[PDB]
Symmetry: C3
């Protein structure tokens, strides 16, 4: 059963490593700009970097959720594929944000498309599962007669 | 195997869509009040809305975790049920918070109950799994004699 | 099938309870220091406590992700084990942070080690799955001849 989900599990792990990467970058910025815990404020370089990490942090469970559902109800390989561009896009997102607020927009857009795609796949997959059983029973009630 | 978890998978997806909804509302508020990234501060309308989104964002993995465990160790349908009120409650939470800080309290309470219920189900489910095997072995050691 | 994952499911639940614990501590601090929603700023006691909760909140999906992958591709018991010290460490993290910023460092370190271990297990597990099938096919292409 490990076989049907190993790609999903592996994209999942690369996502964890990437978030961990983002976290260490934040400690790197905290030192570089004299910003010690708590306090999430400082020079805009630091704020831009804290902010990038946080953003990816809240999108991260959305990503995992849809990746798993799309991967299981639609198609594992395609889901893992979207998985990668998403993650790759979030890597470009973080590095862009770090340099400029504007330079973050292109991979944000890239990352959203990928994430929307996952959602669509999950949506389609769930539809195929539930929709035949339902139309069938809609028809049986009206048969009947 | 998709059959035993499709309800859980579908509540999961509706949760993702809802969070996505919250996110777009925040971009909507960022534009409406001249608040550009980084910066999470501004008029209290904006702050109330940023705050609502964030809150739901951190409760979101708690929700998914318990939903899955309750859904698998207790009963899928009931879990998905709690799933819905929770999500429905978090939707009322966000829309209340957006208008007023006080108007957020009623669906927060509603959302907590639902979330507590999931936890209880998960708890009961895990108990049934582990508890017979344990009492049995407690008894065997004392048999013995 | 509940049997192969009940330990993972149970560490998962204890993690949820712990986060819930962190959340109630924050409401406890909000009242204690006159800090009402929104606003995440206040005396450093409050800020230290808000901050602790937030931190654990973003590490929480990393934890769940790796716990599940390590638990399924490497070994369930060991994964659950790391699960506990991690959670136990994050409990010490939160209580330390609450008292002092410096007093948070030791269980942060403890929690990171545990989390790194999970990642390693997940990594090793995924390697064993994918790596034989690959070396085999690398060899077949060069056979051939
Ligand atoms: C998979 C292992 C992950 C890496 C382990 C060590 S990195 C530190 C880890 N992550 C962060 O701090 C990230 C940024 C955090 N949001 C912040 O503002 O400091 C942490 O708990 N920091 C707490 C703190 O210093 O405030
Ligand atoms: C399923 C697809 C989800 C939707 C895709 C596009 S919406 C933007 C997306 N979400 C948010 O910004 C939400 C609020 C965020 N917390 C903030 O402060 O701006 C993002 O990454 N924003 C980054 C930013 O602009 O700061
Ligand atoms: C498993 C059940 C969990 C517990 C239910 C009730 S506790 C309140 C719950 N958690 C928190 O507030 C935690 C801290 C939050 N980050 C904050 O700044 O207030 C919430 O939604 N608070 C919203 C708010 O008051 O701002
Ligand atoms: C279509 C197949 C996609 C493969 C994704 C594998 C990702 C490996 C990440 C480490
Ligand atoms: C049997 C009831 C199932 C209700 C869920 C419908 C899923 C729609 C997913 C889009
Ligand atoms: C699986 C059984 C299929 C039931 C027939 C439903 C027909 C409507 C769907 C197109
Ligand atoms: C008891 C059954 C609960 C059904 C939940 C289905 C939710 C559909 C969300 C799209
Ligand atoms: C075999 C050891 C299992 C230990 C976990 C106990 C679960 C309690 C859940 C409430
Ligand atoms: C499954 C086997 C049941 C073992 C008997 C344990 C009795 C105590 C639980 C009530
Ligand atoms: C090696 C076995 C580890 C057991 C972890 C069980 C945790 C119970 C938490 C409630
Ligand atoms: C078949 C393609 C699989 C690609 C994923 C490789 C996993 C590496 C995990 C470390
Ligand atoms: C499962 C089949 C094993 C294929 C042989 C691959 C040999 C290289 C791995 C050591
Ligand atoms: Ni099976």
């Amino acid at each position: 059963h490990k076989d049907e989900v190993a790609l999903l599990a592996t994209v999942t792990l690369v996502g964890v490593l990437l978030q961990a990467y983002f976290s260490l970058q934040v400690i790197s910025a905290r030192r570089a700009f004299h910003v010690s815990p708590p306090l999430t404020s400082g020079p805009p370089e630091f704020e831009r970097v804290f902010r990038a990490q946080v953003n990816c942090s809240e999108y991260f469970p959305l990503f995992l959720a849809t990746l798993w559902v799309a991967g299981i109800f639609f198609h594992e390989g395609a889901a893992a594929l979207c998985g990668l561009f998403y993650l790759f896009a979030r890597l470009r997102y973080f590095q862009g944000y770090a340099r400029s607020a504007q330079l973050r927009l292109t991979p944000l857009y890239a990352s959203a498309r990928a994430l929307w795609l996952l959602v669509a796949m999950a949506a389609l997959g769930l539809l195929v599962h539930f929709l035949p059983g339902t139309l069938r029973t809609a028809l049986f009630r009206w048969l009947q007669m």
